[PDB]
Structure 1
Amino acid sequence: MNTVPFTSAPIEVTIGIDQYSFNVKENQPFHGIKDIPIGHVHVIHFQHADNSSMRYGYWFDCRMGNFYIQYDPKDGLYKMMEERDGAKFENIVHNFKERQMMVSYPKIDEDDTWYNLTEFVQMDKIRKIVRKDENQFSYVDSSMTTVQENELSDPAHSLNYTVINFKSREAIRPGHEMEDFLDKSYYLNTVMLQGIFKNSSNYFGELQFAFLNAMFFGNYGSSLQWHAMIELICSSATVPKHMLDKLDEILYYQIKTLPEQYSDILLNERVWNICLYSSFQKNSLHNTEKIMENKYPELL
């Protein structure tokens, strides 16, 4: 069980750690988060009490280094940093734990939600989507645009998700125009799975990471990417059986976790109605269709 200490909390802030969140008051004696499960990526995120504009946060994996948070009064945000001195770090953490100044990652033992939302998400792939190679952790915020959004403006601060475009030469083989547009199996299986992602695990990882950025930061380009990756599968007549079964589980847990009150801005009516009721896979997502119909029957 790993720990992310905080130097201090000088501004009032709501702090999130994965799907959990808690309020910290200005100058409250808060010194971090302990008992973080090893084996998963994690995200620690922030919303200041005075400017709910810009939710922002950091993806990290405690196996990759010792990380802490320190507020920067010049740039005005809580920054993640790596402590390279391992003995200095262990000492700091032990002092803060002895003084009981840390919240505990509050995982219920029955609860597999976080695993189910990050099953295929790897830090190494996160770091290729979010390019900042001097750090082992990755910053994301509400405003960052995606490479594809830029094409349609700062590149260093972009989300380099894999570009998916259904009306593109990459998606449409010469001479198979109608075939490839109405059945996207070529584009899914040959172009994307075999060619770009290499396997379905990496495809699902990017899909899960896009959803999480949409949900936790309200990042619009991430929401677009999540829906595009769903639609590309549902609009393919030929999809491996294990991929469909896994997609159903992935989306089930995403829909389960989504705040009821954010469905209006994070769920695209057209994609979901198409995917559940018209597409080739309209009958292959039983778990997802059941939770959608019981939780958001208005959207449909």
Structure 2
Amino acid sequence: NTVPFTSAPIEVTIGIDQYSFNVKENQPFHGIKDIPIGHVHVIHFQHADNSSMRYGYWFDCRMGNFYIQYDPKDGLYKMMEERDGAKFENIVHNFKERQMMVSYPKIDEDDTWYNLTEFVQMDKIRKIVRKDENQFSYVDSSMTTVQENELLEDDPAHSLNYTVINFKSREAIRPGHEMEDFLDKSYYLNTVMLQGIFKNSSNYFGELQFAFLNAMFFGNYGSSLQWHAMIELICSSATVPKHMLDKLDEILYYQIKTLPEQYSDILLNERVWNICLYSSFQKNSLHNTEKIMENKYPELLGKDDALIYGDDEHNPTIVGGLYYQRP
């Protein structure tokens, strides 16, 4: 399937799924073709200009015929749906036929985009990012989350309606179980979240994967927050469905693997990663993720330089003692 571009007015780096390429100014680029049909996809832009944020559109090829057209008034590329199949079905071949359209590659050995999106569903995307008129979803670097806006009209479509996760909240902590529920988050995970909201492991994972991708592609603060929170919730729970645990190490591994170096200190949360990997209940269940993290980001995790120049809260208070020693 194919996504035509009416034109390429301005110099821009274009990304589709895990791939990226540049288009110069008024180079004859008329879109992408041979897009594998099965997946949700994302097409994202950063202008070479440097005035622009990172922005992009999530879509499903099956739900429509989608095209990109630059908007001078807005000053950015916009996705649109061609309602009439024949007219749209017309635009290619002039562009395929005249070439001028680049081909999505044929997949690497790792089947990467699938591993990143395996649980992501467009209909779920469309409930997080609410713009009911369109069959595709626009996300950019500046979008806040419903959680953040509440804890403080703007367009409701400019808010990311992720599932609200708050570890010190009534929802998370049962009255009369304060210590138990805070130290072991299994009630919040299993009853409140998995059984109550997501209904499925697959839904929970899908949100987690979507949050990561928004965090990576757009450098969206709220998304990174959510992604880490969804990881933390599982790792900080002593009781987790077995099939989720198996799945998690793989999910995280591909995310970390695919992450380019430049976006790492922006995305990654030092505290959460060190907790999950080295002290959480499920630390052992992330063998592969730990290995790759240690390799790609050792400094974040404490791997090794000399002193140039030259507490007890977690221990009991000592009243007095009997001590045998030299002096």
Normalised-by-shorter TM-score class: over 0.9
Which whole-Å deviations, capped at 9, do the CAs of 1:68-112 have from their partners, x for residues lacking one?
A: 000011011101000011011111112210111011112335241
Which whole-Å deviations, capped at 9, do the CAs of 1:205-256 have from their partners, x for residues lacking one?
A: 0000000000000001100000000000000000011101111100000000
C-alpha contact 2:131 2:137 (8 A) present in aligned 1: yes
Report the alpha carbon displacement of residue 120 of structure 1 after superposing the two structures with TM.
0.2
* Higher mean C-alpha displacement, 201-210 vs 50-59: 50-59
Instruction: Name the CA distance, whole Å, in 1 between partners of 2:13 and 2:244.
Output: 37
Instruction: Name the CA distance, whole Å, in 2 between partners of 1:52 and 1:208.
Output: 28
Instruction: Name the CA distance, whole Å, in 2 between partners of 1:121 and 1:299.
Output: 28
Report the alpha carbon displacement of residue 49 of structure 1 after superposing the two structures with TM.
1.2
The equivalent residue for 2:163 is 162
Report the alpha carbon displacement of residue 37 of structure 1 after superposing the two structures with TM.
0.6
C-alpha contact 2:5 2:68 (8 A) present in aligned 1: yes
* Higher mean C-alpha displacement, 280-289 vs 161-170: 280-289
The equivalent residue for 1:17 is 16
1:54-73, aligned counterparts within 5 Å?
54-73=53-72
Report the alpha carbon displacement of residue 122 of structure 1 after superposing the two structures with TM.
0.4
Instruction: Name the CA distance, whole Å, in 2 between partners of 1:153 and 1:136.
Output: 21
Report the alpha carbon displacement of residue 52 of structure 1 after superposing the two structures with TM.
4.9
Instruction: Name the CA distance, whole Å, in 2 between partners of 1:52 and 1:287.
Output: 39
| TM-score using structure 1 length | 0.97
Which whole-Å deviations, capped at 9, do the CAs of 1:259-299 have from their partners, x for residues lacking one?
A: 11221111100000000001101111111111111111110
Which whole-Å deviations, capped at 9, do the CAs of 1:89-146 have from their partners, x for residues lacking one?
A: 1111122101110111123352411000000000000000000010000000000001
Which whole-Å deviations, capped at 9, do the CAs of 1:11-68 have from their partners, x for residues lacking one?
A: 1111100111111011111000001111100000001111253110000010000000
Report the alpha carbon displacement of residue 154 of structure 1 after superposing the two structures with TM.
4.8
* Higher mean C-alpha displacement, 153-162 vs 62-71: 153-162
* Higher mean C-alpha displacement, 86-95 vs 14-23: 86-95
* Higher mean C-alpha displacement, 184-193 vs 50-59: 50-59
Q: 1:182 to 1:153 in 2, by over 3 A?
A: farther
Secondary structure at 2:299 match in 1: coil
Instruction: Name the CA distance, whole Å, in 2 between partners of 1:50 and 1:64.
Output: 33
* Higher mean C-alpha displacement, 261-270 vs 120-129: 261-270
Instruction: Name the CA distance, whole Å, in 2 between partners of 1:33 and 1:263.
Output: 29
Secondary structure at 1:101 match in 2: coil
RMSD: 1.3
Instruction: Name the CA distance, whole Å, in 2 between partners of 1:75 and 1:22.
Output: 23
Identity rate, percent: 99
Report the alpha carbon displacement of residue 156 of structure 1 after superposing the two structures with TM.
3.5
Kindly report structure 1 stretches of 4+ aligned residues shifted beyond 3 Å: 152-156
Higher Rg:
2
Secondary structure at 1:205 match in 2: helix
| TM-score using structure 2 length | 0.90
Instruction: Name the CA distance, whole Å, in 1 between partners of 2:122 and 2:184.
Output: 33
C-alpha contact 2:67 2:80 (8 A) present in aligned 1: yes
C-alpha contact 2:173 2:188 (8 A) present in aligned 1: yes
Secondary structure at 2:69 match in 1: strand
Q: 1:79 to 1:154 in 2, by over 3 A?
A: closer
Secondary structure at 1:188 match in 2: helix
Give ranges in structure 2 of 5+ residues lacking alignment.
302-327
Instruction: Name the CA distance, whole Å, in 1 between partners of 2:202 and 2:270.
Output: 27
Report the alpha carbon displacement of residue 189 of structure 1 after superposing the two structures with TM.
0.3
Paired positions, count:
299
Give ranges in structure 1 of 5+ residues lacking alignment.
none
Instruction: Name the CA distance, whole Å, in 1 between partners of 2:108 and 2:46.
Output: 28
Q: 1:268 to 1:242 in 2, by over 3 A?
A: same
The equivalent residue for 1:183 is 184
Instruction: Name the CA distance, whole Å, in 1 between partners of 2:38 and 2:200.
Output: 21
Q: 1:198 to 1:173 in 2, by over 3 A?
A: same
Are 1:132 and 2:131 counterparts? yes
C-alpha contact 2:130 2:156 (8 A) present in aligned 1: no
Q: 1:109 to 1:231 in 2, by over 3 A?
A: closer
Instruction: Name the CA distance, whole Å, in 1 between partners of 2:262 and 2:218.
Output: 15
Instruction: Name the CA distance, whole Å, in 1 between partners of 2:2 and 2:53.
Output: 25
C-alpha contact 2:33 2:101 (8 A) present in aligned 1: yes
* Higher mean C-alpha displacement, 213-222 vs 257-266: 257-266
C-alpha contact 2:3 2:66 (8 A) present in aligned 1: yes
Secondary structure at 2:285 match in 1: coil
Q: 1:232 to 1:153 in 2, by over 3 A?
A: farther
